[PDB]
Amino acid sequence: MYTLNWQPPYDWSWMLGFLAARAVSSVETVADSYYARSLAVGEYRGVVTAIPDIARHTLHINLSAGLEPVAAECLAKMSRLFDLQCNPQIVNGALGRLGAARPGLRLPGCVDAFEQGVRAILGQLVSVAMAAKLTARVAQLYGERLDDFPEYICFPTPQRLAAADPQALKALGMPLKRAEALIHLANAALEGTLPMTIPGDVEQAMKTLQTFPGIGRWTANYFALRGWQAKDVFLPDDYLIKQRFPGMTPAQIRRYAERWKPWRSYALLHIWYTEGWQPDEA
Amino acid sequence: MYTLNWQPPYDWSWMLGFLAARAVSSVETVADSYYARSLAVGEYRGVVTAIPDIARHTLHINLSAGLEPVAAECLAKMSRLFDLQCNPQIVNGALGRLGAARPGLRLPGCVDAFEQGVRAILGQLVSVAMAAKLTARVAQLYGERLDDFPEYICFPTPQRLAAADPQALKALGMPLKRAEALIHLANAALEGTLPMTIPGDVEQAMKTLQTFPGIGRWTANYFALRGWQAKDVFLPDDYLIKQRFPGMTPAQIRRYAERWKPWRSYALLHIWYTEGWQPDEA
Amino acid sequence: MYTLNWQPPYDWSWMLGFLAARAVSSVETVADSYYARSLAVGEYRGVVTAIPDIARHTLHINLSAGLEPVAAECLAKMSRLFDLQCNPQIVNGALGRLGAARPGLRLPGCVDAFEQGVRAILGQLVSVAMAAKLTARVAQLYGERLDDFPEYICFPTPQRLAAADPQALKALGMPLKRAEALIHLANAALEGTLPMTIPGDVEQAMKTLQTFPGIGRWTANYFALRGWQAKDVFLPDDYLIKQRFPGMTPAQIRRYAERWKPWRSYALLHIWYTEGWQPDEA
Amino acid sequence: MYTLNWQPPYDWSWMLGFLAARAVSSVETVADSYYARSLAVGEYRGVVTAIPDIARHTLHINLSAGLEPVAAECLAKMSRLFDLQCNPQIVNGALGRLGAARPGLRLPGCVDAFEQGVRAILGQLVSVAMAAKLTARVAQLYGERLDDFPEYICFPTPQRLAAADPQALKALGMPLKRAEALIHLANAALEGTLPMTIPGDVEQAMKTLQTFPGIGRWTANYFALRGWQAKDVFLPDDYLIKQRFPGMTPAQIRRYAERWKPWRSYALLHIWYTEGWQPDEA
DNA sequence: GACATGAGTGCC
DNA sequence: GGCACTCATGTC
DNA sequence: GACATGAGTGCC
DNA sequence: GGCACTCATGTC
């Protein structure tokens, strides 16, 4: 139905693949030709379906009737999720070799910063697939079901998780401390304290984010990257990253990662996805 | 040449008129058959042109070239400014009598919460046309002029205004105390402490805004109404409002306005644009 | 055994009566010729007996053996509770007629500021007799009993009240907010945030007490008067004072008392103990 | 004149030797048989003279005419300075061997925590002798001179030092962050943020102190020790202490010192004044 | 991974 | 020796 | 209009 | 009494 453009190349298999691995049961659905999920904008609700058209560099978005009144916001959320704004020539041009193997690489964003915040936290310490298992359990218990599409369930809203029993969340498969962080975040989201759009000063906003309980430097960075689509942040504390930089302290990796400014976020993604990458033999 | 839907009726004449009076020179151009303004998103800049099509109950939005990369967010911005989500059959079905005369009334949004924040402050105490000309100067001294449409100019950014010298601002025609108010608001916007989208607890978010320097209840209320497009706020402290409720105190006015929950914002716009309106014997 | 002298005239009859009305059963014992109570100074505990000998305008202080290692501190405390430093000539000289009927008048201090802090809070709203009873129940439940004096009991320490159960204090016959106030005051004392000795800037100091939950202007002022024995404070908010200045509001009363500076604390006492008094309608 | 008791043994030779090296000209005089200094208790000023009487196991205190109205408070100040409360049999029971060589060791206190805070600061990173002359310059440049005893000047009040030029101080012979410290400390005192008497929670109170500009863990510790006469603190960050524990780290010292709870303050003194002392190699 | 403890650098 | 910046530990 | 004092009013 | 909320009043 609705259509948005993008500049080539765009590696849709990598992107769908990436989203598929972290997908949450009942919320999202990923296949090789499309992406689709439940979506709430205020108290408007429905299902969004995105279908890329490689041929014409266009992404077709479809909205169930419930979302129509806020169609444009729905489109905006989709474009931030798929990084339709990226100009590969600028990025791949600046990263040289690091990006030559997958010039179609994009930054997987989110559809709602609060959700991404809940997602980032649950992803602490555990595996990617394990966090999806956990997020699925949290959603199942606190998310609203779509009347028009019982198969789908909306990601738990800020007000619901805000009014949730720490013990209940703990019971889902996380420490008390973790669940306390989720509830805290929900309140910031209610009060309008959790930036939902990227702030002008990402570094400062991340420092503030770090005062939040349960949110350390890793979480604030990952969240800035996915939740704000901040394009210049590296994850020197990441698990996989520590392995791509065999025997290197976080500050070292961060110093090294500086050669990729102002697109560190993209360099990070290329490293995560370059099987045998290794720092320059210099 | 993008396009969005709206539900009838829609009083464009009224809307364009409201924006027309407040149009800030070089930034926005308002006419009978279209609206157009400079628009910044991150660092993509261009000019937006909105042309209503009463025939097809549709709104045609056209973006220049420096905005196409982020088209979707631009579209979301116009849909918030023009209240496209509004179901008039629902609001009037609730307001009843009060809104029967101008059923096509809509809530004039904003394209960015920071800007709206600046306009709110720069509109304290002074007349409308005044605030416009003043605001136009600020945009003149801090605006990012377009290299594709030099005629137009972007609205100041939080950082371009957070690094502004008060005196220089005051010199434009405003007390110091207020010039400071901007600078502050600018910082808050920089570190993501100024909700850019409507928060869950609109009352709370307003209380927090009231701590800010130069921001009082009237400013917060008005900011929520236009900056967040909050639908259920009334402005009992407003100049014109006090006259519409002769002799009543803020609390009385507020007590009365409770008869229009949850659309007090629409109630307010109808009462505002109804010379000679008066409260009942209730 | 120990002796401390004073300046004639000293109205012991009045001093003992005042303290008599507010005596806390099991903590203090007030007779017509002597005063005595439990006393703790760190881990040093015992009983204190003060016998005033008018003949030789001297005060005789006896100390149980448990307090002997800290005799001086016990002595300084008795001297703060009995205002032995007062120079009746100077005060009565700067007060004139107001302090004619009872020139032996002294400012009733305290033996511990945290205690006086608890008294001030419990003294809120209820009558002197109720405060006394109320305070008595708190003592009975949290106080330390003296092994050599089973009839006596030490006033509750911050360590105990800080750990108290809000509901337990409530059960003693006090609003929850009052018990929470007590628990917060105790935590401050433990932390060192409660000025236990008069600060150089009483105004700043009180304004800082008023941020404490449960403590308002009245309590702060009254705490300063008794707990710091500050000599220049009035209680324009006092009940009995409001009746001594019919029709006048706090500020009016406060503008009137400026005449008596810098001994407003004394003035306050006299106007308090002269049922007839009434201002000089300017 | 006045007499205070003390339990034997009491090493007066040492105590006076301690205070004598740190004596501040014009403020205090120290001799083989007595100690004396200016003293301000509110608006009362004078000279205090302390003369130990080994025969009677007693301390004789003499007050100049201006301190009589607040004699007991003066006596209490002297008791905290000379640690008359100490029961050497208890402290030496615990300490065991460590203090076997000087069973009469006492904790040199202070007569005012503020002064002690100032002293603690001015004595940072310098020599005992230097701090004395440095402090004296400050005393002179901002003190109160006694009319009845011209060669004596009362230590600077919080007010005076609060309103001191942050350069006139650097002048006397100290850095800038050095005069910042004093000036901050002084304001703290004016308002009541600096505990003037030992807090129920020493650790917590010290933490807060460490937030003070210029006040680090060493200062906070030493301040607890002398300004509050806390008896169970230790100074692992002290220069000389490190040498007494060759090599060892500030947490291993702490770990080893734990064996002297709850009299670490005494243990500290013995270790300081026992040169060839070295920990158990065990 | 978040968070408090501890260390050792290293500069005014 | 106050004070900002890291790393290395060790439960949760 | 924001913002201090500053009283009143109504519940804890 | 504490305290949040409410209605002047005066200033910039």
Tab-separated table of all heavy atoms in Angstrom, chain B residues 26-55:
chain	number	residue	atom	x	y	z
B	26	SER	N	10.354	33.740	6.606
B	26	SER	CA	11.468	32.972	6.033
B	26	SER	C	11.381	31.485	6.398
B	26	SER	O	11.807	30.612	5.629
B	26	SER	CB	12.825	33.544	6.489
B	26	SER	OG	13.125	34.774	5.846
B	27	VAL	N	10.818	31.208	7.572
B	27	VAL	CA	10.661	29.841	8.050
B	27	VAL	C	9.448	29.157	7.434
B	27	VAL	O	9.558	28.061	6.886
B	27	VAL	CB	10.482	29.800	9.563
B	27	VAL	CG1	10.520	28.360	10.033
B	27	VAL	CG2	11.554	30.644	10.242
B	28	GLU	N	8.294	29.811	7.530
B	28	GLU	CA	7.052	29.266	6.990
B	28	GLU	C	6.415	30.237	6.000
B	28	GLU	O	6.570	31.445	6.125
B	28	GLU	CB	6.057	29.014	8.122
B	28	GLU	CG	6.690	28.623	9.447
B	28	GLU	CD	5.823	29.003	10.639
B	28	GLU	OE1	4.724	28.421	10.809
B	28	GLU	OE2	6.239	29.898	11.404
B	29	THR	N	5.703	29.702	5.017
B	29	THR	CA	5.004	30.520	4.037
B	29	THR	C	3.580	29.996	4.027
B	29	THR	O	3.346	28.883	3.557
B	29	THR	CB	5.595	30.372	2.603
B	29	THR	OG1	6.844	31.070	2.511
B	29	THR	CG2	4.641	30.940	1.576
B	30	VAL	N	2.629	30.771	4.550
B	30	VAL	CA	1.246	30.303	4.567
B	30	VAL	C	0.334	31.071	3.625
B	30	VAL	O	0.285	32.297	3.651
B	30	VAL	CB	0.636	30.344	5.989
B	30	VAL	CG1	-0.767	29.727	5.963
B	30	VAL	CG2	1.529	29.573	6.968
B	31	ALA	N	-0.393	30.324	2.800
B	31	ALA	CA	-1.318	30.880	1.826
B	31	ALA	C	-2.655	30.131	1.847
B	31	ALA	O	-2.843	29.181	2.605
B	31	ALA	CB	-0.703	30.809	0.443
B	32	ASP	N	-3.576	30.544	0.989
B	32	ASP	CA	-4.899	29.942	0.950
B	32	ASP	C	-4.957	28.484	0.509
B	32	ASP	O	-5.756	27.702	1.026
B	32	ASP	CB	-5.804	30.774	0.043
B	32	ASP	CG	-5.595	32.262	0.232
B	32	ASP	OD1	-4.480	32.748	-0.069
B	32	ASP	OD2	-6.538	32.944	0.687
B	33	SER	N	-4.125	28.111	-0.449
B	33	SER	CA	-4.166	26.746	-0.937
B	33	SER	C	-2.999	25.851	-0.531
B	33	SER	O	-2.947	24.682	-0.932
B	33	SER	CB	-4.322	26.764	-2.458
B	33	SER	OG	-3.477	27.736	-3.037
B	34	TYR	N	-2.071	26.380	0.268
B	34	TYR	CA	-0.936	25.575	0.706
B	34	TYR	C	-0.117	26.135	1.862
B	34	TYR	O	-0.135	27.330	2.142
B	34	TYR	CB	0.019	25.309	-0.465
B	34	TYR	CG	0.892	26.489	-0.851
B	34	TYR	CD1	2.218	26.564	-0.430
B	34	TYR	CD2	0.390	27.530	-1.626
B	34	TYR	CE1	3.023	27.647	-0.770
B	34	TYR	CE2	1.187	28.620	-1.974
B	34	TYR	CZ	2.501	28.672	-1.542
B	34	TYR	OH	3.287	29.752	-1.873
B	35	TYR	N	0.613	25.237	2.514
B	35	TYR	CA	1.495	25.577	3.616
B	35	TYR	C	2.883	25.086	3.198
B	35	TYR	O	3.004	24.096	2.483
B	35	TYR	CB	1.060	24.853	4.886
B	35	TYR	CG	1.937	25.126	6.077
B	35	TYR	CD1	1.682	26.197	6.928
B	35	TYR	CD2	3.029	24.310	6.360
B	35	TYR	CE1	2.495	26.449	8.045
B	35	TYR	CE2	3.851	24.558	7.478
B	35	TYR	CZ	3.569	25.626	8.308
B	35	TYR	OH	4.356	25.844	9.410
B	36	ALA	N	3.927	25.773	3.631
B	36	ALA	CA	5.278	25.372	3.281
B	36	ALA	C	6.238	25.928	4.305
B	36	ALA	O	6.062	27.037	4.794
B	36	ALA	CB	5.633	25.886	1.899
B	37	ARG	N	7.257	25.159	4.643
B	37	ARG	CA	8.223	25.635	5.619
B	37	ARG	C	9.567	24.940	5.457
B	37	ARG	O	9.685	23.940	4.739
B	37	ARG	CB	7.701	25.408	7.045
B	37	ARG	CG	7.496	23.932	7.418
B	37	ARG	CD	7.357	23.776	8.916
B	37	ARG	NE	8.596	24.134	9.599
B	37	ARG	CZ	8.672	24.715	10.796
B	37	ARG	NH1	7.575	25.028	11.473
B	37	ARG	NH2	9.858	24.968	11.325
B	38	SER	N	10.579	25.495	6.112
B	38	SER	CA	11.907	24.916	6.079
B	38	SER	C	11.779	23.769	7.062
B	38	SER	O	11.047	23.879	8.054
B	38	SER	CB	12.950	25.911	6.588
B	38	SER	OG	12.813	26.116	7.989
B	39	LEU	N	12.477	22.671	6.804
B	39	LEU	CA	12.375	21.542	7.705
B	39	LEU	C	13.693	20.818	7.908
B	39	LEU	O	14.320	20.375	6.950
B	39	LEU	CB	11.322	20.564	7.182
B	39	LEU	CG	10.779	19.597	8.232
B	39	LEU	CD1	10.232	20.407	9.404
B	39	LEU	CD2	9.693	18.712	7.630
B	40	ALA	N	14.111	20.699	9.161
B	40	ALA	CA	15.350	20.005	9.463
B	40	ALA	C	15.081	18.705	10.211
B	40	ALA	O	14.184	18.627	11.049
B	40	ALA	CB	16.259	20.895	10.285
B	41	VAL	N	15.844	17.674	9.877
B	41	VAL	CA	15.730	16.378	10.533
B	41	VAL	C	17.151	15.867	10.620
B	41	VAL	O	17.722	15.376	9.642
B	41	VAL	CB	14.870	15.393	9.729
B	41	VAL	CG1	14.658	14.112	10.532
B	41	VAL	CG2	13.530	16.031	9.410
B	42	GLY	N	17.726	15.996	11.802
B	42	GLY	CA	19.095	15.582	11.961
B	42	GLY	C	19.877	16.617	11.186
B	42	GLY	O	19.978	17.762	11.612
B	43	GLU	N	20.409	16.236	10.032
B	43	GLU	CA	21.171	17.175	9.230
B	43	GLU	C	20.721	17.201	7.787
B	43	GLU	O	21.388	17.767	6.918
B	43	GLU	CB	22.657	16.878	9.348
B	43	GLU	CG	23.180	17.184	10.749
B	43	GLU	CD	24.459	17.997	10.743
B	43	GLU	OE1	25.505	17.450	10.345
B	43	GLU	OE2	24.416	19.184	11.132
B	44	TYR	N	19.577	16.568	7.555
B	44	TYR	CA	18.934	16.551	6.259
B	44	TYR	C	18.069	17.791	6.342
B	44	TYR	O	17.393	18.005	7.346
B	44	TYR	CB	18.066	15.312	6.128
B	44	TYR	CG	18.885	14.089	5.923
B	44	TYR	CD1	19.145	13.207	6.974
B	44	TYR	CD2	19.462	13.834	4.685
B	44	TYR	CE1	19.969	12.096	6.789
B	44	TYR	CE2	20.285	12.732	4.486
B	44	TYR	CZ	20.537	11.866	5.536
B	44	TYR	OH	21.349	10.779	5.323
B	45	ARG	N	18.101	18.619	5.311
B	45	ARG	CA	17.315	19.832	5.339
B	45	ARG	C	16.693	20.070	3.987
B	45	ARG	O	17.199	19.613	2.963
B	45	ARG	CB	18.197	21.009	5.741
B	45	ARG	CG	18.912	20.785	7.047
B	45	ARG	CD	19.952	21.840	7.295
B	45	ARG	NE	20.835	21.450	8.392
B	45	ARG	CZ	20.560	21.613	9.684
B	45	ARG	NH1	19.416	22.174	10.067
B	45	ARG	NH2	21.435	21.202	10.596
B	46	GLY	N	15.579	20.782	4.000
B	46	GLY	CA	14.878	21.067	2.775
B	46	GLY	C	13.657	21.895	3.091
B	46	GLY	O	13.560	22.517	4.153
B	47	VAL	N	12.718	21.888	2.155
B	47	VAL	CA	11.482	22.631	2.282
B	47	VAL	C	10.281	21.724	2.055
B	47	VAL	O	10.222	20.980	1.071
B	47	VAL	CB	11.445	23.789	1.267
B	47	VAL	CG1	10.004	24.229	1.001
B	47	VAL	CG2	12.270	24.939	1.803
B	48	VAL	N	9.323	21.805	2.975
B	48	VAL	CA	8.115	21.009	2.887
B	48	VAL	C	6.981	21.886	2.378
B	48	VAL	O	6.880	23.057	2.747
B	48	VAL	CB	7.737	20.453	4.272
B	48	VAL	CG1	6.550	19.529	4.171
B	48	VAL	CG2	8.902	19.735	4.846
B	49	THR	N	6.136	21.311	1.533
B	49	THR	CA	4.984	22.002	0.973
B	49	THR	C	3.755	21.112	1.130
B	49	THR	O	3.708	19.997	0.607
B	49	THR	CB	5.180	22.293	-0.523
B	49	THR	OG1	6.272	23.202	-0.693
B	49	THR	CG2	3.921	22.898	-1.113
B	50	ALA	N	2.759	21.605	1.852
B	50	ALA	CA	1.541	20.847	2.073
B	50	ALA	C	0.404	21.481	1.294
B	50	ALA	O	0.145	22.676	1.412
B	50	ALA	CB	1.215	20.819	3.547
B	51	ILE	N	-0.281	20.672	0.501
B	51	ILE	CA	-1.374	21.168	-0.307
B	51	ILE	C	-2.610	20.320	-0.086
B	51	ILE	O	-2.681	19.183	-0.525
B	51	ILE	CB	-0.991	21.133	-1.799
B	51	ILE	CG1	0.179	22.090	-2.047
B	51	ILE	CG2	-2.188	21.490	-2.660
B	51	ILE	CD1	0.780	22.002	-3.439
B	52	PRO	N	-3.611	20.864	0.612
B	52	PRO	CA	-4.827	20.078	0.844
B	52	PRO	C	-5.671	19.856	-0.409
B	52	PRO	O	-5.751	20.718	-1.284
B	52	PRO	CB	-5.561	20.889	1.898
B	52	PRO	CG	-5.094	22.304	1.630
B	52	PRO	CD	-3.631	22.128	1.371
B	53	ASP	N	-6.288	18.682	-0.487
B	53	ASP	CA	-7.138	18.315	-1.607
B	53	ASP	C	-8.494	17.943	-1.003
B	53	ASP	O	-8.749	16.777	-0.697
B	53	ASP	CB	-6.542	17.119	-2.357
B	53	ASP	CG	-7.200	16.886	-3.705
B	53	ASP	OD1	-7.152	17.807	-4.552
B	53	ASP	OD2	-7.759	15.785	-3.921
B	54	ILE	N	-9.347	18.952	-0.823
B	54	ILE	CA	-10.662	18.773	-0.233
B	54	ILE	C	-11.455	17.734	-0.990
B	54	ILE	O	-12.189	16.933	-0.401
B	54	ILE	CB	-11.462	20.090	-0.254
B	54	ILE	CG1	-10.651	21.198	0.413
B	54	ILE	CG2	-12.791	19.910	0.467
B	54	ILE	CD1	-10.307	20.891	1.836
B	55	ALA	N	-11.309	17.759	-2.309
B	55	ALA	CA	-12.022	16.836	-3.171
B	55	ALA	C	-11.782	15.398	-2.735
B	55	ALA	O	-12.727	14.662	-2.444
B	55	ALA	CB	-11.569	17.036	-4.606
